[PDB]
């Protein structure tokens, strides 16, 4: 099967359409959630630009090509990925009637380039040096959460996010690879969140009360086991010479003892007393007549521990893995200030504070273990990614749309190529700016004809990027409201857009193959 | 899973109760047009009253079961 | 869908309509599911067996949709139920005709976003008004009268003609025990079906009720260890083999003989370690009993599944099958054991009594199990209806006179504001009207003759329907000043958890 | 069983439809084509040679259309997206109006003297280039480097491909005709950076010795191939079974040894410190060399060792018993086995039989190698044409439009029957200068028309047009140039291919 000179472009623009038309109401607080249970065939809440690509199980190749382009955007902005689909099927609809008049779709093309370097060029020009002071890391990260959740929950979801960023700040890091771990708690209500800035053990040492409160906890991260499993093979499991699989049982029981005896060589020689603690992580199940005996020479000994907490707690903390428990120095180990064993839920989760080295700050929400945990899981996530693009950046700018009428301005009324050929590109550019402050502002009530004449006045008129209210639907300074976007996130959305617009444009065929 | 409400559910559980009340409306009167009952079983059954009949009936309305289940107790 | 991509089951039309007609039609079955009932719900099961209940997390449990909006509430529904007890008929059928009032202001051209919005002021000044039209407290829940003044609601919540008998008895078998400052067994109020002696001869036993004929003499002492097993004692039969029949009987008189020395040394091991009772969830063997009563050591014919895991719960034991000598790992903790005839049943009794550590366990005694356990779908939210955590649970009016008391607040409330958030305030106020009118549709009367009274009467707290005459003609029953009480607790998420839900439903287009 | 027009017609219809999407995707600007599988997998290309391996072909024609784009790729491997593109409007203009008078045989001869007449017509318009000059030989790589627009650092890689291809130019016939790129050999290092590297003598060697096997340094001594019999004596002179007992340790062993150090001593002749063997190699053979203190090496493929022969210009020796420095290890030689990376890579220079360099370039990663390869790899192969060709032809339609007159004014001299064809094959020239006014967007019946204008006057010799402003333009004033021969030989192969399918009347089983 083939697609001829009018199909194959006319199937790729009207995929763009429905594509941008169901997206539309995903960004910013307007932005409304989607369910998926066509994806995977389950209950699943689900909102970003790129994630909701992923889940859906689309077969239009322009959509899995954007699934790909916004990818590389969700890998260092995350939002935004939301702003690259409206604007797309809003830049195809501007030229395609240019080609609906009768055009070629590379001098359109060929006017796409420099309208974009001079949107580039404003980019510099609109650029806000703001300074990186946590009211201002706030506001960043409000839109960004108001954009995926409710704004009750941002707020309180706010003061976990801006706090961990500042602490990145101390390890001097403008991205966020660490201090992104997101633990769930157990709970109903998914109103409370809680900032550790150390780790959170999962677990609770089936005798409780060993030594909850540990001031000097020398951390030993490891997977020892004591409730050991006991065969007798002849090959490889179990065989029928009954001569020949008496004679390993006496050995069998020799090892539980010999690793009860280990713990306590241990603990005189990192602490010698009991005034300073000892914590025994252990990944595996600790048998209680040992928890009873541990407990009472001042060792906490927690069992059951997740492997992925294994690699983590030995980052900021420390403590390596044996399977013995010899005598080791405090050199060997790693440190936490603070141990506290907290309890919400069917399960113990004994917080680890103020570490040997705080590397990693452990983000721990609650919730009543839904997909409205999984929908405030990756809401804070995309929290996290907006911020990380302001630690990189200087200048953090009033978005929501007060950017995308101050190009359009200088776009369409100054031709910075005046030559004809190339403007035809640039009003098919300007006029793909709009899509996003009109649309959602009419999503609101007033509708997209009353927004684009106060914020094309206003802004002309003031200099001051008023951007868009989205919750009445008029136009009002981004600066005060506190919807912001990043120097690094507005670049790569102009970039991103531009590169995948261009090459589904300049197709005449598309053929099965393979 | 699968419902249905309403009266046009209502009323079709009458009329199932009402073929089964059809059946024994003289079964204690000694009277009426036989039926010997062959089931894949294969084999003959007869009864003077409803009762062992209503033992043999698998019936395939469940609102018709309970009207079965009050006269079985 | 214009290409081959975008696969979705929502859309302008399904997203507006069908989610909401999805949510409707299963709150089309809760339309009497709360308050005063003359509905019933016959259902076969994934299991095909005939039950009739009028419990909608029996009934939705069984109900299966792929409508994720009709999916999600029924989630909101079991968290009203696993913090207060019932209401979780309320929570389905309120969010139901919430969201089709919601599809009027679709119908006039609203956003959706005011529509979101205007429910969530409209929930959070309910919930101000609402401690206000707090009438009473739980002052004695020692009391029996008190006790029982709010369980009448709740079991009528289930059937209005068994509402009095139970919420004495309910008291009678002692929620009243609790002084609910962190007490209350979730499993050690586990409900007892013992059938004959007919539904109104159901009585009280406290402590744990186990329907198994007790085999063997009484234990040794009431403050005996309680050896709990998985499976202790055998029985034996057997048929052909890989050759058939196998070639002798020796043998199998030889297996016999070291059978019963073994379970000789079973009740013996058991006996020398301290327990004198033992917990048997296999069969009875006849070698292991006649050693069992020289040894006084009472024995439990049989246990199903239920049966040792509470076991293992309140005496904290642990369930293996013993095929070596027992020894006690298993920490006798009641003590008082008693053999009861309840129903004419050899009914184990197990007894302690502690402060915030009590048992205390509902039994009922019926001739039908198939009416029986329905009756105790009743009792299964009447007692977590007690676990407000609080002494005073702050008692509001019953049946839901608190709707129409409500409902004149809130759109007093929608009109002085301003805005497209300004008519979901009114709509909202009209989402407490149609639990009562969809109830006096099963008292005998029409709605307007109803809805116009309980608006009419004032801010009393007082005026509702029941079932009765008084419900139909005057529509005016005391289900505040008649024994008829509901709590604040249950109230507030109820309203709570309805709301959260259906905006959480509405933004959805896919 | 098919037969007629209908197989004619067939054949013109599959390979006009394939040129039409390829034709867009002609140009340095150009149209991707989309190719969707059944499992919704997207190919984004313009390469034909990418695409006409993807697409599934169900006629024979278009099966011998990717033949005829093997042929063009494995001679070349550039210009395979172009040979298909001229070849459609050939049997697409000419065919119908003269085969519905049917006269294949005219045709045949037509497109014989349409060959002929564009080989002068090219020494008419191409001006010499110069060999000996790299910025002569730099804009026509620049022009080549933009097709996939990389310049990151393939600009400095312009220089090391021309200090390739320009060094390695020895090839022989008779009349020695050079059009070789084997015996260049890129480096493909994930280490250091390419911008501080530069060519070597010799040929240098990625491909298996990739450690100092063979020293860590050698000024001096000789490099020494190997594919002589040092297949060891098992008898006194003769071949028994070889060491699996200690009655065949004691006696065999002392003649084992006996037959390796004779060839070792052949080789201390010529004193070197290197020796790699690859036919005949032992283990004892290359281990007896570590006691007579020349570290030995094998596990290396042959086309390495034509490299390795090629990298000291040397003959391989096949006799054993006497080794020269005149056999192998031609002159003083120079081998330097330095730390790029972490590895510890070979170089081979001081090549006697001398002008043998190669491609040395390293990026900080082997995706930023791959990348600068790519854009260096289409580089060899233009200045391998340059060695073929020395004279430069214009890019665009500066070419195509001055050849597509010369036929006119032929077809007016003959005026036999074959002045048809030749018409068809002037607008068959065009289609070229026809989709780059598509690969800018411009009016494409006015740049064709000035374009004839153009030749009225100016002849077209630098004028053609350009896909990327959209203008006819002075090939001179903008760079876009490439050799007469990678030209003639797009050209010969559309000329294979209109006389192939000329020939097809009939398609049976």
């Known amino acids: 099967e083939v697609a001829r000179a009018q199909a194959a472009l006319a199937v790729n623009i009207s995929a763009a359409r429905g594509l941008q038309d169901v997206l539309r109401t995903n960004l910013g607080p307007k932005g409304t959630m989607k369910m998926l249970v066509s994806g995977a065939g389950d209950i699943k809440l689900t909102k970003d630009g790129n994630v909701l690509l992923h889940e859906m199980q689309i077969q239009h190749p322009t959509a899995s090509l954007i699934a790909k382009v916004a990818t590389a955007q969700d890998d260092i902005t995350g939002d935004g990925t939301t702003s690259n689909v409206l604007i797309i099927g809003e830049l195809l609809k501007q030229a395609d009637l240019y080609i609906s008049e009768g055009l070629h779709p590379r001098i359109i093309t060929e006017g796409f380039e420099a309208a974009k370097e001079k949107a580039l060029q404003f980019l510099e020009e609109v650029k806000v040096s703001r300074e990186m002071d946590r009211e201002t890391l706030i506001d960043v990260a409000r839109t960004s959460l108001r954009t ?215 983000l721990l929400i609650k919730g009543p273990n839904k997909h409205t945990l999984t929908q405030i899981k990756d809401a804070v996530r995309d929290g996290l990614r907006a911020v990380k693009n302001a630690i990189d950046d200087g200048c953090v700018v009033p978005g929501a749309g007060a950017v995308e009428v101050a190009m359009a301005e200088a776009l ?18 300007a006029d793909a700016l709009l899509i996003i402050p009109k649309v959602l502002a009419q999503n609101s009530g007033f509708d997209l004809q009353e927004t684009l004449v106060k914020i094309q006045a206003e802004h002309s008129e003031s200099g001051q990027l008023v951007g868009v209210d989205l919750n009445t639907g008029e136009p009002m300074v981004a600066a005060e409201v506190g919807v912001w976007d990043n120097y690094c996130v507005k670049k790569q959305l102009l970039h991103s857009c531009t590169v995948i617009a261009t090459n589904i444009l300049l197709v005449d065929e598309i053929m099965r193959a393979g | 899973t699968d419902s249905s409400q309403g009266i046009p559910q209502l009323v079709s559980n009458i009329s199932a109760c009402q073929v089964i009340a059809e059946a024994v409306r003289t079964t204690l009167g000694p009277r009426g047009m036989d039926k010997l009952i062959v089931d894949g079983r294969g084999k003959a059954t007869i009864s003077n009253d409803g009762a062992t009949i209503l033992k043999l009936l698998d019936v395939v309305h469940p609102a018709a079961k309970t009207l079965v289940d009050i006269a079985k107790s | 869908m214009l290409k081959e991509g975008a696969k979705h089951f929502s859309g302008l039309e399904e997203a507006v309509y069908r989610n909401i007609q999805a949510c409707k039609e299963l709150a089309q079955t809760t339309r009497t599911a709360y308050g005063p009932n003359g509905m019933n719900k016959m259902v076969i099961n994934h299991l095909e067996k005939l039950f009739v209940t009028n419990d909608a997390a029996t ?117 009243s025990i609790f002084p609910d400052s962190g007490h209350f067994n979730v499993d050690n109020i586990r409900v007892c079906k013992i059938l004959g002696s007919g539904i109104s001869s159901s009585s009280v036993l406290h402590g744990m009720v186990f329907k198994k004929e007790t085999e063997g003499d009484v234990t040794s002492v009431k403050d005996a260890k309680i050896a709990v097993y998985s499976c202790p004692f055998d029985g034996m039969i057997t048929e052909t083999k890989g050759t058939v029949l196998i070639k002798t009987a020796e043998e199998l008189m030889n297996f016999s003989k070291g059978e019963e020395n073994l379970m000789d040394a079973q009740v013996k091991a058991i006996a020398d370690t301290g327990a004198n009772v033992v917990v048997t969830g296999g069969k009875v063997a006849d070698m292991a009993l006649h050693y069992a009563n020289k040894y006084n050591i009472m024995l439990v014919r049989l246990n199903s599944k239920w049966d040792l895991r509470r076991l293992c719960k309140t005496v904290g034991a642990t369930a293996l099958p013993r095929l070596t000598p027992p020894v006690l ?75 129409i008391e409500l409902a004149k607040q809130i759109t007093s409330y929608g009109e002085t504001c301003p805005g497209l958030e300004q008519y ?65 607790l249950g109230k507030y998420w109820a309203i709570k958890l309805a709301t959260n839900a259906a905006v959480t439903v509405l933004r959805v287009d896919q | 069983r098919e037969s007629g027009r209908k197989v004619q017609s067939g054949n013109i219809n599959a390979a006009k439809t394939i040129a039409d999407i390829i034709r867009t995707c002609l140009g340095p600007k150009s149209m991707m084509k989309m190719l969707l599988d059944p499992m919704g997998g997207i190919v984004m290309t313009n390469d034909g040679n990418a695409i ?417 402003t959209g203008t006819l333009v002075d090939m001179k004033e903008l760079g876009i140039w490439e050799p007469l021969a990678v030209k003639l030989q797009t050209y010969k192969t559309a000329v294979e291919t209109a006389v192939l399918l000329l020939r097809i009347d009939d398609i049976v089983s």
């Not at chain 1, 369409?412 to 098919?428: D, F, M, T, W």
């Not at chain 3, 205007?118 to 008190?146: F, T």
């Not at chain 3, 009922?364 to 029986?372: A, Y």
């Not at chain 4, 080989?119 to 730099?138: A, E, G, N, Y």
């Open chain 4, 52 to 468: 006409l391996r993807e697409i599934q072909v169900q006629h024979p024609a278009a099966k011998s259309m990717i033949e005829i784009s093997r042929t063009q790729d494995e001679e070349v491997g550039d210009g395979t997206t172009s040979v298909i593109i001229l070849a459609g409007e050939m049997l697409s203009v000419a065919e119908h109006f003269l085969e519905q008078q049917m006269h294949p045989t005219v045709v045949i001869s037509a497109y014989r003297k349409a060959l002929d007449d564009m080989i002068s017509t090219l020494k008419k318009i191409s001006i010499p280039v110069d060999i000996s000059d790299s910025d002569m030989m730099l804009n026509i790589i620049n022009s080549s480097i933009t097709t996939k627009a990389i310049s990151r650092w393939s600009s400095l890689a312009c220089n090391i491909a021309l200090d390739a291809v320009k060094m390695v130019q020895f090839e022989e016939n008779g009349r020695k005709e050079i059009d070789i790129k084997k015996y260049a050999r890129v480096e493909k290092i994930p280490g250091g950076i390419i911008e501080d590297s530069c060519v070597l003598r010799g040929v240098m060697i990625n491909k298996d010795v990739t450690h100092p096997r063979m020293r860590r340094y050698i000024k001096n001594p000789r490099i020494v191939l190997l594919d002589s019999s040092l297949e060891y004596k098992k008898g006194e002179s003769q071949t028994d079974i070889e060491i699996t007992r200690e009655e065949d340790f004691t006696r065999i062993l002392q003649m084992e040894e006996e037959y390796i150090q004779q060839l070792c001593e052949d080789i201390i002749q010529l004193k070197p410190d290197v020796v790699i063997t690859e036919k005949g190699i032992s283990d004892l053979a290359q281990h007896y060399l570590m006691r007579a203190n020349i570290t030995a090496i094998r596990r290396v493929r042959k086309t390495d060792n034509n490299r390795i022969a090629r990298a000291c210009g040397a003959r391989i020796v096949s006799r054993p018993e006497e080794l020269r420095e005149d056999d192998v290890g031609t002159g003083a030689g120079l081998l330097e086995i330095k730390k790029i990376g972490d590895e510890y890579f070979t170089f081979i220079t001081d090549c006697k039989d001398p002008k043998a360099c190669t491609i040395l370039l390293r990026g900080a990663s082997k995706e930023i190698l791959s990348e600068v390869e790519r854009n260096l790899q289409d580089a060899m192969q233009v200045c391998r044409n340059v060695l073929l060709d020395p004279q430069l032809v214009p890019g665009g339609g500066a070419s195509e439009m001055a050849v597509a007159h010369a036929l006119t004014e032929k077809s007016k001299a003959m005026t036999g029957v074959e002045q048809w064809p030749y018409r068809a094959v002037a607008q068959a020239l065009e289609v070229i200068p026809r989709t780059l006014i598509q690969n800018c967007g411009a009016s494409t019946i006015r740049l064709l028309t000035s374009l004839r204008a153009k030749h009225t006057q100016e002849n077209c010799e630098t004028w053609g047009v350009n896909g990327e």
């Open chain 1, 412 to 429: 369409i009324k100054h031709k910075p190529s005046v030559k004809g050929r190339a403007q035809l590109g640039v009003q098919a550019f």
């Open chain 3, 59 to 175: 009934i939705l449990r069984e109900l299966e949709v792929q409508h994720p909006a009709a999916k999600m509430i029924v989630m909101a529904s079991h968290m009203q139920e696993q913090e207060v007890g019932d209401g979780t008929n309320f929570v389905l059928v309120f969010a139901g005709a919430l969201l089709e009032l919601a599809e009027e202001l679709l119908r006039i051209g609203l956003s959706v976003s005011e529509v979101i919005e205007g429910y969530e002021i409209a929930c959070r000044k309910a919930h101000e008004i609402l401690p206000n039209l707090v009438c009473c407290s739980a002052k004695n829940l020692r009391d029996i009268d008190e006790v029982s003044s709010l369980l009448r609601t709740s079991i009528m919540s289930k059937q209005y003609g068994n509402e009095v008998f139970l919420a004495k008895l309910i008291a009678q078998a002692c929620v």
């Open chain 3, 424 to 488: 979901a305030i009114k709509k909202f106020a009209e989402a407490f009207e149609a639990i009562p009118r969809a109830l006096a549709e099963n008292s005998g009367v029409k709605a307007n003759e109803v809805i116009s009274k309980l608006y009419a009467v004032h801010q009393e707290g007082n005026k509702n329907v029941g079932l009765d005459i008084e419900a139909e003609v005057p529509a005016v029953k005391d289900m505040l000043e008649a024994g008829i009480l509901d709590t604040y």
């Open chain 1, 148 to 362: 995926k959740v409710h704004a009750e929950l941002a707020d309180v979801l706010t003061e976990a996010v801006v706090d961990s960023i500042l602490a990145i700040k101390k390890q001097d890091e403008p991205i966020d690879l660490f201090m992104i771990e997101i633990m769930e708690m157990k709970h109903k209500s998914e109103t409370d969140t809680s900032l550790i800035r150390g780790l959170v053990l999962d677990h609770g040492a089936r005798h409780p009360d060993m030594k909850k409160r540990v001031e000097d906890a020398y951390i030993l991260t490891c997977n020892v086991s004591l409730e050991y499993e006991k065969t007798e093979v002849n090959s490889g499991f179990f065989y029928k010479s009954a001569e020949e699989r008496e004679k390993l049982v006496k050995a069998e029981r020799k090892f539980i003892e010999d690793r009860v005896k280990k713990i306590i060589e241990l603990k005189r020689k990192v602490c010698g007393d009991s005034d300073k603690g000892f914590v025994v992580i252990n990944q595996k199940g600790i048998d209680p007549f040992s928890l009873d005996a541990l407990s009472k020479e001042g060792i906490v000994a927690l069992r059951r521990a997740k492997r992925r907490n294994m690699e983590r707690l030995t980052l900021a903390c420390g403590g390596v893995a044996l399977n013995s428990f010899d005598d080791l120095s405090p050199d060997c180990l790693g440190h936490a200030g603070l141990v506290y064993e907290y309890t919400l839920g069917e399960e113990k989760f004994t917080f680890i504070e103020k570490c040997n080295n705080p590397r990693s700050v452990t």
């Open chain 3, 329 to 403: 790992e298993e920490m006798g903790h009641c003590d008082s054991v008693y053999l009861s005839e309840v129903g004419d049943t050899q009914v184990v009794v197990f007894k302690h009594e502690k402060e915030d550590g009590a048992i205390s366990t509902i039994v009922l005694r019926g001739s039908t199990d198939n009416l029986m356990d329905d009756i105790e779908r009743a009792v299964d939210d009447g007692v977590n209806t007690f676990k407000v955590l609080t002494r005073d649970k702050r008692l509001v009016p019953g049946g839901g006179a608190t709707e």
